């Protein structure tokens, strides 16, 4: 689970 789409 990553912070957003940049990850």
């Amino acid at each position, epitope marked *: *689970h990553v*912070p*957003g*789409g*940049g*990850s």
Partner: antibody
Amino acid sequence: QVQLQQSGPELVKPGTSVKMPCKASGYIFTDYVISWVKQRTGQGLEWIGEIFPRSGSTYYNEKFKGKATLTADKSSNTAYMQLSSVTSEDSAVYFCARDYYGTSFAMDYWGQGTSVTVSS
Amino acid sequence: DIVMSQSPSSLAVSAGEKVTMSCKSSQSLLNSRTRKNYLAWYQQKPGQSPKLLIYWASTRESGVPDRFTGSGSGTDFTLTISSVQAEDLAVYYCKQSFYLRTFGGGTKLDIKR
């Protein structure tokens, strides 16, 4: 239909806690993140944080770290947001939302919002 | 981390007219891999919850009239409403989902008649 079912209106005293459910139906609860959004009367929208129900992993807007606590119960398809040590500043409508993590990263379905008044 | 700016803060037009409104981000919202800007537009009518209009800066969501168009890249984004309707009375928010989430302060659309 996708649907997010939030609790009714709430009065809560200053310096106590409130816990509000967001009951998900119409999709695979464990496939999508649940986001929470704050809206003070006559103000804009403000992101609180998100939970991944599959794993219980959370992320928070830095202002709501320790204020807001996000949980999920996979057996009931229900996400919960607790607010602790509440002040009059926490008086707001609070939305839950299905967040299409992985692809769109957009909030494609919203609950009807839960109105919270913080007052003695 | 990321700060979002919307302008103008308020706007008024007659039914059938065009409006555009602008959204600015403090860092680029383009992901080099994927090629997508993580920028979405939301509509909130009075007394209602918000509704997703556009994601990936330019992709209309399902259920959204084609008069609503999103455009821009990196740090500068635009929402266009071709031929405004009475029913388009709302506040329009842009929002970043590149890293965490941030909403702009909104653009309120009033209607002249």
